[PDB]
A paper describes a structure:
Henipaviruses, a genus within the Paramyxoviridae family, include the highly virulent Nipah and Hendra viruses that cause reoccurring outbreaks of deadly disease. Recent discoveries of several new Paramyxoviridae species, including the zoonotic Langya virus, have revealed much higher antigenic diversity than currently characterized and prompted the reorganization of these viruses into the Henipavirus and Parahenipavirus genera. Here, to explore the limits of structural and antigenic variation in both genera, collectively referred to here as HNVs, we constructed an expanded, antigenically diverse panel of HNV fusion and attachment glycoproteins from 56 unique HNV strains that better reflects global HNV diversity. We expressed and purified the [name] ectodomains and the attachment protein head domains and characterized their biochemical, biophysical and structural properties.
Author numbering:
A (entry chain B), B (entry chain C), C (entry chain A): 22 to 482
């Protein structure tokens, strides 16, 4: 890539950032109960829980039936001389993708630990705090957690005899209907097929009044650096069990780990407007360029958070990049497109390494040390300003100071090649088909005329 | 549609789902009061409700003025000695669309029932619970409801003498300002024209701390099947009265009914990547195809929820399609495009009716029963695997079982007709059309060369 | 612009609205403390504030480091006869844009007032209410504000001895972790570079359970009309100080003011479907047209709120338009494109100035006073109906009265030039591009043949 030609065409090299991808995940199991455990309210609660049970039995049971029907269709057992491999039976899957088969194998792998967690059903249903721990084994533990258990241990419990019992029943019914509406939002796409559709940690934290840090601290991941603070909206978990007796869900989440792809640099660009032809134009180049061993591609930051030093993505998002745009980035300024603007929010100057790239035709350029104006050179459009011209520079309304030097060759003195204008809207490209087509039928008419005139020239002699 | 040629090019038939549209609605009236009724706080509340009244009088009154002005135009009694009905006076409406005139007719139809509800203004303003009923007639009733009437009957009421009166006044002012900010979000677009703009039930349920099931249960709709549980984010409603004395809004909502369009099947397609020309490509086909009497069209699922067995749309979204795409779907795989990728998240195998469609050039394919590798045939690109090859198949890492057979036609032996390499669907191709225009401009130069050929043609003398 | 021809092609003139821009901002200063002040809880709270302090020290300190670096970059000085200020070092700033330099100038301008506010740190840390005032000067005041200061002055405080102290500690820890999760959402992008990134007032009001009116009333903006009532999501603001001892942020916000751009009219358009060629078509025109002294442009209403009478934008959004679209709007109906639909939600009639523009080919048109059908004229496509034809018009199932007069010439007696069908598909444009491929390879072959003829027969004999 040549930055001098691309600076003369109107693109200024910005920051250089690294590239990191989530990869190599380990698994940790949590359990979520859905019916709140009340024991202080054994005096005045009536049978208000029965409506909530009839509301959630239409959600829990169709999850569990599809889960166990997905569980039957994988069977282990040795295929002859080969050792193992947990055969997924394709007779009873109908139509399935690769990720669905991977999820089926994940359930068949997690069956034993699901049974180990399910062996403590009486231990799970007896909790009476928000988040606590239970001893799973000699060194393993579960992290059972319920959002509403605090609210019927510090708000509704002290009004056990001050307030009337029917008011407690009505308030409990209102809060349970609101919470049932909260389950019916996060577990919405899961009801289609609750083995392949995962659960984001932000939507899962929406059950606890938007408390992501409680889930993160109870899970075990503890961020200590600046890059892992904004990261935390991408922990992904899936359902492995949907037990109906205690009305609870056993969930398995993946602890992320940020690996770095070797030798990849993300390059940002600043686009300014230049005055040509009596109009304001901008180059049509993408902002982000991924460079890895003199190989250029495109990425999209539609799901990736941008930190101060590196790009953190969920997964690789490398797209192929144009050979014409490859010539545009490398050497050919004529291959780079342009677009027309007239709006007022177009920047006209920028700073890079103590080097001012300024359009001095529209913005007044001066030097404070000598008090003389700076005029546009006719050979270039974007004006170099460095310390060789003047130290203190008036640009816009601003005193600025400069430094360093040009760098290899100056982009002010060489020739320029302005590319063609590029438009967008489909009526314009239908008219582009038009002025393709009249020119096309001129070329065909010239083919016919020229080929007749060949034989009156070559044939006649 | 022929699935065999489209599987040979790289598109696999997915599930088949039905199509159902909301339609034929009945109407039901609710009322929402805005001033919370306090009678327990007659000792220590001061006149803090007056600021809330002055805040909401700038909202209720300009709604009510336009609401009575839009019903002041339509008049009944068709001049026709025989024909009779409602007439909309177009000279006073100015500029209007069809739905605005339909809403004006709806208000003129609902004026009598709005007056019947307005006849119990003293009954509406005397409520002191969250949701209750009032006797509208001998068999009809209203469902008056207040969001904050629970919170100043179970939280602020018991601290009537423990806490200081100015602290209750400050807390009531903070709660009323927050609630006034909650009215100023949901009734935002309604302030422009409060007769033609409907209200979604999610935005209306945002007033009640996100409790949609409370409004669904108090309205009368009780879903009992799996399809209607996820439905309930599309119940619309419009304002019919904006009474300023009791500061309440009489609202009319439509109970939805899911009707089924006869003989329409929604079909999905799974796209896999095939290795051709030393590169990874996928065919460019839409995922969703509606089929109705051998007629193919296009739908967009941007506002339609997807259930497990059918598509539920708020309204018909049938878009036309190109005849080239019709030939691509029917017989002509040369009319189907292809696009180029190099990313890692491209699936290379899938399962359909026990038949494995796998690209064995990129993924290692083996058989467990015989332990021999499977090689790509040169006459095809996508490899078909059934029980005739081998029962247990090694794909990737997974053991899988297969079943059934080809059905009618086999993609394993058919000829290949991979079409043109179509370029980028977004605007970048126009930039290519830009240099195609530059190609045109060099053919114009060729025309200019034939402006110089026609010169030396005149040197034929 | 001629509305008769544009009504003949299928576009109906809608409402006329004004255009207003937010501009000329003055500055106000607020301070946001982060640690809630507790003094009633000196008996039973333990040291649970220490974990919250260790959580927020990772947020506060890098902001302060980046801010003091940005103050170090600017340097107050005067090279000769200068404006006695500014001066930013190019070497110390690296790579930057214009807005970042403007933000550096803003911090250097607001340093003195930041020190004046910072002189009352002991006054800032001693507050015990939600929002109160402190005397900054003889006529200036600050508006120190805390969101959770109400909730540990009316809810956790009265249960000081009824509830156990460990339950108070657990509830305080849960509330503080939830609030730390609330800081880690609004100041998310601000951690990257905390001097050039603004804070929206809606995201800032999300800390106080979505109470925008509390911030607006405590800030000083008191909107009293209908236009500025919905405005209030565009207040914005930036950070100027990040003090670590009291753990507070000093923020500077802009009080808005709406100015009017002179002589600009925003025009909407209603698009109806017309039946031509046995198909249903709509013209391809933009909805919004800005007209300013015969100068047409395009605007995008993606960030602008639409009131009843005028458009309010955060900033000017004038985009250029194609001259063929200018010919479409002025005189040429053949320059206006069209698109094909078959869906049912296409409006077929409208009303403008008491004049009915209706498509009577698809929808039945009758006159109620005379009881005769209305037939489509072959010369026109869209039927004009006024009081000269019949007063009461059956359209659809509706009575419509008409009036006023026609307006210059009718859109029914003029000729209609239907433009080209704008309908673009990637495979079709790739196929005609392959026609261009074979076309230039024909023209280059014939030009090589004609150049050989230019060589050895122009010098022949
Ligand atoms: C999930 O799997 C269990 C276990 O069945 C095993 O896996 C299946 C995929 C097949 O390969 C089976 O051959 C295999 O054993 C299924 O439970 C079984 O259900 C059937 C009915 O579908 C039961 O048969 C009944 O049993 C008693 C006999 O007294 C009577 O009530 C009836 O006459 C009837 O025969 C069967 O006992 C039961 N268990 C076993 C071990 O086979 C289960 O159906 C399956 N799928 C789902 C969707 O739940
Ligand atoms: C809504 O419609 C009502 C009904 O009147 C109808 O519309 C009018 C514009 C006329 O065309 C009528 O023929 C037609 O029935 C309007 O109510 C009218 O309001 C005006 C004031 O706006 C009243 O005039 C005043 O009323 C009292 C009468 O004691 C005195 O102060 C004055 O002497 C003065 O007349 C008028 O009485 C009243 N009723 C009628 C029958 O005209 C109303 O204006 C209209 N529009 C709106 C925006 O509400
Ligand atoms: C921000 O600015 C402060 C203030 O310093 C002033 O501005 C700088 C840009 C320079 O032009 C300074 O000359 C100018 O006074 C900087 O604080 C200064 O930091 C240095 C270290 O970088 C301190 O030096 C210390 O000196 C003694 C030596 O015995 C020891 O305590 C230490 O080992 C250390 O070397 C210096 O005292 C300090 N203060 C002043 C008034 O100069 C600061 O570094 C700068 N930048 C940042 C990123 O914070
Ligand atoms: C509401 O439910 C709670 C659940 O915690 C009951 O809490 C009770 O709290 C008391 C102290 O306030 C506990 O008594 C003491 O506990 C420890 C452990 O043995 C020890 O210091 C003493 O020996 C003494 O027993 C008590 O254990 C605990 N009870 C239970 C069942 O958890 C509270 O009583 C309930 N309220 C009502 C009205 O029942
Ligand atoms: C808050 O306001 C409400 C409503 O005005 C008041 O509710 C009242 O509650 C009392 C409870 O003692 C009810 O008393 C009734 O007494 C007899 C007992 O023989 C019997 O008829 C009932 O079972 C009932 O207990 C009273 O009817 C009820 N009032 C109404 C209008 O429903 C309440 O007093 C107020 N609270 C305060 C603190 O002022
Ligand atoms: C919890 O903190 C609050 C903070 O406000 C303490 O409030 C105290 O309120 C009482 C009245 O309830 C005040 O006493 C009286 O105030 C007025 C003067 O304004 C006057 O009537 C009397 O001369 C008398 O002073 C009191 O000033 C105020 N502050 C303090 C420090 O007591 C409340 O006491 C705290 N509770 C506990 C248990 O610490
Ligand atoms: C593009 O640049 C190369 C050198 O990098 C040069 O050889 C070639 O002629 C250029 N092509 C143009 C300007 O079309
Ligand atoms: C640019 O070219 C001019 C001559 O045209 C020369 O004086 C100047 O030094 C050049 N700048 C460089 C090589 O940086
Ligand atoms: C296409 O090329 C011609 C000839 O150089 C030029 O006049 C025209 O502006 C070009 N069009 C575009 C859209 O670049
Ligand atoms: C030129 O126009 C004709 C219709 O007159 C059309 O059939 C043909 O495809 C066009 N050729 C192009 C756009 O290259
Ligand atoms: C499309 O396929 C049919 C047979 O399925 C064939 O007759 C026809 O010629 C094909 N059309 C093309 C290749 O354009
Ligand atoms: C496909 O061709 C194979 C030979 O490669 C043959 O065995 C098989 O019967 C063919 N299937 C058809 C024509 O359906
Ligand atoms: C556009 O309209 C003008 C008159 O306003 C006319 O002279 C011109 O020929 C038209 N151009 C077309 C229809 O292409
Ligand atoms: C349209 O022309 C007809 C005659 O063809 C005439 O009757 C009618 O008044 C005209 N409309 C105008 C000039 O608005
Ligand atoms: C069309 O483009 C291809 C590459 O896309 C090129 O090799 C060829 O020369 C062009 N012409 C023809 C006739 O294929």
């Amino acid at each position: 890539v040549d930055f001098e030609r691309l600076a003369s065409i109107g693109g200024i090299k910005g920051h250089s950032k690294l590239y990191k991808i989530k990869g190599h995940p380990t698994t940790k199991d949590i359990v979520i109960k859905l019916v709140p455990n009340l024991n202080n309210l054994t005096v005045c609660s009536e049978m208000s829980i029965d409506g909530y049970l009839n509301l959630i039995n239409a959600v829990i049971i169709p999850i569990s039936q599809s889960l166990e029907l997905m569980r039957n269709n994988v069977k282990d057992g040795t295929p002859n001389e080969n050792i193992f491999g947990a055969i997924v039976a394709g007779a009873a899957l109908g139509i399935a993708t690769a990720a669905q088969v991977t999820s089926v194998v994940a359930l068949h792998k997690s069956n034993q630990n699901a049974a180990k967690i399910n062996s403590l059903r009486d231990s799970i249903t007896k909790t009476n705090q928000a988040v606590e721990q239970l001893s799973l084994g000699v060194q393993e533990t579960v992290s059972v957690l319920m959002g509403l258990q605090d609210q019927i241990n510090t708000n509704l419990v002290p009004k056990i005899n001050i307030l009337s019992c029917k008011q407690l029943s009505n308030t409990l019914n209102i809060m349970l209907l609101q919470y049932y509406s909260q389950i019916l939002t996060v577990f919405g796409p899961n009801l289609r097929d609750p083995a392949t559709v995962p659960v984001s940690i932000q939507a899962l934290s929406q059950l606890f009044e938007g408390n992501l840090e409680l889930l993160t601290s109870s899970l075990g991941i503890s961020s200590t650096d600046f890059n892992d603070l904004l990261t935390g909206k991408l922990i992904t978990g899936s359902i492995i069990w949907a037990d109906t007796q205690g009305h609870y869900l056993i969930l398995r989440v993946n602890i992320p780990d940020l690996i770095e792809v070797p030798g990849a640099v993300i390059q940002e660009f600043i686009k300014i407007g230049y005055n040509f032809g009596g109009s304001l134009w901008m180059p049509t180049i993408p902002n982000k360029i991924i460079i890895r061993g003199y190989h250029l591609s495109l990425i999209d930051s539609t799901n990736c958070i941008i930190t101060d030093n590196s790009y953190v993505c969920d997964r690789d998002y490398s797209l192929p990049m144009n050979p014409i745009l490859r010539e545009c980035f490398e050497g050919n300024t004529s291959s780079c497109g342009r677009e027309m603007v007239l709006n007022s929010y177009i920047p006209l100057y920028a700073l890079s390494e103590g080097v001012i790239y300024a359009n001095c035709l529209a913005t007044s350029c001066k030097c404070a040390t000598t008090n003389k104006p700076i005029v546009q050179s006719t050979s270039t459009v974007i004006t170099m300003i460095d310390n060789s011209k003047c130290p203190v520079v008036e640009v816009g309304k601003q005193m600025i100071s400069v430094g360093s030097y040009l760098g290899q060759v100056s982009p002010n003195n060489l020739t320029i090649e302005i590319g063609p204008p590029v438009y967008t809207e489909p009526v314009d490209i239908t008219n582009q088909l038009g002025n393709i087509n009249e020119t096309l039928s001129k070329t065909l008419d010239l083919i016919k005329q020229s080929n007749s005139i060949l034989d009156m020239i070559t044939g006649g002699l």
